[PDB]
């Protein structure tokens, strides 16, 4: 199923402090190699929040899991019916995002539909005060099994570089549950090691973000 | 000169604690967009040090400098004769690298020839003890003019993620001087914002590192 290059389509509909916006994205992924390649366009004009604060919200099934760890791959075991990914992201000393997404296969395309709502942000805050640089660091995503719920609990902190050399923390509380009733692989504790690079498209005039990502499982 | 896509060739010859090795690399860069794309092969077998500790050593002229900052672009002003880049990199609580390179244009290809010597590393150290993860974070490279010397002084600290969640610091002391006698643009203080993602090549059997980098000037 994830053996080749799989087309991905991402759609987000959000609201941050009353401000409504939409982002649609296209790209493709490659499990075998852990590479993601996505282009996101804010389809309603200008994005009221910085492009980097949506990186984690805008498809972990694309992680390369070395062979000996394939029984720990919850993400692809829930395919192709999918899983629901929920998160509560707390930005240090500022608002929080609450997102719910549904990631399933629609034909041949891996679809990720999300609904984001964020509140409590300050206008003097780095988030709304667009004080965040356009770049991304590497982080370790920590996964554990939620036995009861038949899913996984994921948790990690993101480091956003503010343009004044400081660092904006974003506390992530993640939960994943399958969409189908069938059995699914509950893993042993391990972590995903992700890298991400943001860039632009010279030939794109609409507000957007080009994201390049490499993710590989480890910790076993 | 840097208006299009320029082929790059990198060659390093080094010695770390007696261990001799070579690395040759090929790729191309795109100034207009700040993108670098390089593939490095350790031509003498296995690399005695981790691939990430050589990222900064293994061509800043590829940074995108927005128009209004073009009088601050020392790197491209020294072309095509080039510049000599020297550095002394101190790894926190471990050895240090001392490199000298020469970056000039050879025909159409931008060449970067380096000679690295590093000493004082521990075998129980993260560097020789290969305890560093295969990923890279984003950093701010700080540039100032060395008026007297007719060049620039660059300085920054790199953050290498150790596989046990900790962070290995690498203190960089950089110096750049032109190779030609002609005048060169000495800039105002500003900084380069770089992002880097390491990956592998499925079809490559020789020890190597695939590097993808995006660099843009800022601070003015």
From Swiss-Prot, chains A, B:
Changing residue 193 to F: In H9; increases fluorescence at 395 nm excitation. Green fluorescent protein has been engineered to produce a vast number of variously colored mutants, fusion proteins, and biosensors. Further generation of mutants led to more stable proteins (at 37 degrees Celsius for example) with brighter fluorescence and longer fluorescence lifetimes. The keyword Protein transport does not apply. Pfam families: GFP. Changing residue 194 to H/W/F: Results in significantly red-shifted excitation and emission maxima. Changing residue 144 to T: Increases fluorescence at warmer temperatures such as 37 degrees Celsius. Changing residue 141 to I: In Azurite; shifts the excitation and emission spectra to shorter wavelengths and increases quantum yields compared to BFP. The keyword Ribosomal protein does not apply. Signal peptide: none annotated. Changing residue 136 to F: In Sapphire/H9-40; exhibits a huge Stoke's shift, with an excitation peak at 399 nm and an emission peak at 511 nm. In Azurite; shifts the excitation and emission spectra to shorter wavelengths and increases quantum yields compared to BFP. Changing residue 70 to R: In Topaz; shifts the major emission and exitation peak up to 20 nm. Changing residue 24 to R: In mut1.28; shifts fluorescence lifetime from 3.03 to 2.76 ns. In mut2.2; shifts fluorescence lifetime from 3.03 to 1.94 ns. In mut3.3; shifts fluorescence lifetime from 3.03 to 1.88 ns. InterPro entries: GFP (IPR009017), GFP-related (IPR011584), Green_fluorescent_prot (IPR000786). Energy-transfer acceptor. Its role is to transduce the blue chemiluminescence of the protein aequorin into green fluorescent light by energy transfer. Fluoresces in vivo upon receiving energy from the Ca(2+)-activated photoprotein aequorin. Belongs to the GFP family. This is Green fluorescent protein.
């Amino acid at each position: 199923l994830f053996t080749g290059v799989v087309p991905i389509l991402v759609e987000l509909d959000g609201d941050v402090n009353g401000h409504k916006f939409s982002v649609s994205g296209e790209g493709e992924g490659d499990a075998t190699y852990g590479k993601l390649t996505l282009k996101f366009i804010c389809t309603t004009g200008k994005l009221p929040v910085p492009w980097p604060t949506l990186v984690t919200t805008l498809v972990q099934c694309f992680s390369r899991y070395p062979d000996h760890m394939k029984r720990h791959d919850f993400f692809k075991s829930a395919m192709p019916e999918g899983y629901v990914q929920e998160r509560t992201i707390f930005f240090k000393d500022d608002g929080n995002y609450k997102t719910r997404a549904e990631v399933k296969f629609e034909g041949d395309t891996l679809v990720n539909r999300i609904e984001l709502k964020g509140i409590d942000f300050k206008e003097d805050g780095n988030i709304l005060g667009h004080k965040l640089e356009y770049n991304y660091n590497s982080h370790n995503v920590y996964i554990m099994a939620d036995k009861q719920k038949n899913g996984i609990k994921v948790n990690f902190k993101i480091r956003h570089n503010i343009e004044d050399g400081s660092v904006q923390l974003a506390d992530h509380y993640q939960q994943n549950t399958p969409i189908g009733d069938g059995p699914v692989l509950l893993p042993d504790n391990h972590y995903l090691s992700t890298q991400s690079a943001l860039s632009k498209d010279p030939n794109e005039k609409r507000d957007h973000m080009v994201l390049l990502e490499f993710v590989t499982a480890a910790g076993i």
